Every structure is written in C-alpha cells, then in structure tokens.
C-alpha cells in the first residue's frame, strides 16, 4: 500500500514492527517465520526482518 500528499501540507507518519516474545503467536497470526517489511520513500527507506527475542 502507499500514499502521497494531496493536502499540500507536511505530514507526520508513524508505524511499528512486531517482535513477539514467543513464536506460536507468529505462526498463528501471520503464518511466517519470515519477517520482511519495507517502508519506503524517496529520501528515507528502511526494511525490517526481526525474530522472536525473549
């Protein structure tokens, strides 16, 4: 998914990245041990691939 400005004002955006304390959630909810996220812009861009970490 995506968005870009129509409002012509500056915009402030927040998001998050899930780090479960156990795996049974991770399989049960999302059904991948793979994490790969890519939140991207022109200036900024970053990816995320975390694990369980108790």
């Amino acid at each position, epitope marked *: 998914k995506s968005y870009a400005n129509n409002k012509e004002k500056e915009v402030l955006v927040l998001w998050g990245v899930h780090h479960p*304390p156990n795996i*049974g*959630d991770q399989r*049960a909810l999302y059904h991948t041990e793979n994490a790969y996220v890519s939140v991207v812009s022109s200036h900024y861009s970053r990816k995320f691939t975390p694990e369980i970490a108790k």
Partner: single-chain antibody
Amino acid sequence: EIVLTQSPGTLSLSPGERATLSCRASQSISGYYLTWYQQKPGQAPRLLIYGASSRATGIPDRFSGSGSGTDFTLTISRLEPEDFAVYYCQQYGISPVITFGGGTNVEIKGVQLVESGGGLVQPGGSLRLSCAASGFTFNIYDMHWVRQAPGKGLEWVSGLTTGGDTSYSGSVRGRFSISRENAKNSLYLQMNNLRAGDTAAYFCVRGVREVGATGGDPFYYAMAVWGQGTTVTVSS
C-alpha cells in the same frame, strides 16, 4: 451471522465404526472459524476439534475432520459406547456472533469459572446473574454467555470483546444487559422482560485471547474453557 445445519441431529451406529458428520451453513465461511464439542447429558460440554482439521489438548486421535467454505465436516475414526453423546458446532461470526448447530446424538448400538444465581422469576419480571473467575487473568479473554434448552439445539445469547464491541441477537438485545469487571475477576448479566424462551439452562464461557500478554496461553478462534452452567425459568 449465518444459519447452520448439522447433519445428522441423531444417528445410531455400532462399535468398530467410523462416523461422518457434516455441519454446513448458508454461505462459505473461511475454515479456522468453527469449533466442535461433545456433551454427555448431565455433564457440561467438552471441546474436541477446531478449524475443520486440528485437535485439542488431552486426547486420542480418532475424532478427525476436514472441509471448508460452506461445508465443514468432522469425521470419526472409531466409535465406542463411552462416546454416547451429543456433539455441537460453534462458529465465530465476522458479525461477531456465535452460531450453533443443534446437537448431534451418537447412539452406540449393542482455572475455573463459577456461575451465580440460577432459578425462578415471574414472567415479564427481572433478575440478575453473575459469574466469578478463578485462577487466571479475566483481563484478556473475550467472553460469552450462552443458552441451551434441555435436549435441544443451542442458542447464543450474548458475548463481548474486552474493548467493548458487544454482540447480541436482534431478538435478545435490550432485554438482557452485560457488564464486565477484570479487577474484581467477575462478570454480570442484568436481565429484564423475561418470557418462557428463557426457560432453559445457561452457561458462562471463556473464549479468545485477544492479541497479547505474557503466558503459556496460545489462542484459537475457538473457546478456551466453559463453566458448569445453571438453570433459569419464568413460571407462575
């Protein structure tokens, strides 16, 4: 949520035999969505199966099923006279409404909750019930109040997520009223405008781990655990 239809509501079969039961609805409905129960009359329900495949804790391997979309199915590998019982079909709506298949007798041929207050009232009158919690975190789970006439198909009275999105039926709504307390570890159901449709037994029921907390507690979209229920009746 959608009308189910079990198949059959009662069957008669012999030892050393399988048993196929098919609970199917109006629409096609996504398959980690149903859970499957048994009851000995006199006993409360017990949980067996969920999501058309998979199996609950403390078990043999014989009750096993399949099926998807409109037609969900639980089959059985072997029949035994200890299995003499009515098996049920409970599904979580997306309109967050449990719906109930009407019980399926097998005849074989030759931690805890506590309810509070079941009994009599006058019809058209007023009375309250409660439940109280023992040995867990009543914070987390999505709760349900449920009804059951004797030897009949069930009906679902009400349930509520821990954020506040209620679900009632359009007929039951308003006449009952739920309210919940986590710090006290208890639940409340104030009830008014009561007629003979309520002449039946009820249960308090603990369902779904919402998204998160610490514990050795996974989740399904089935129940967790039940209570022993109690009777309620209008009569004069």
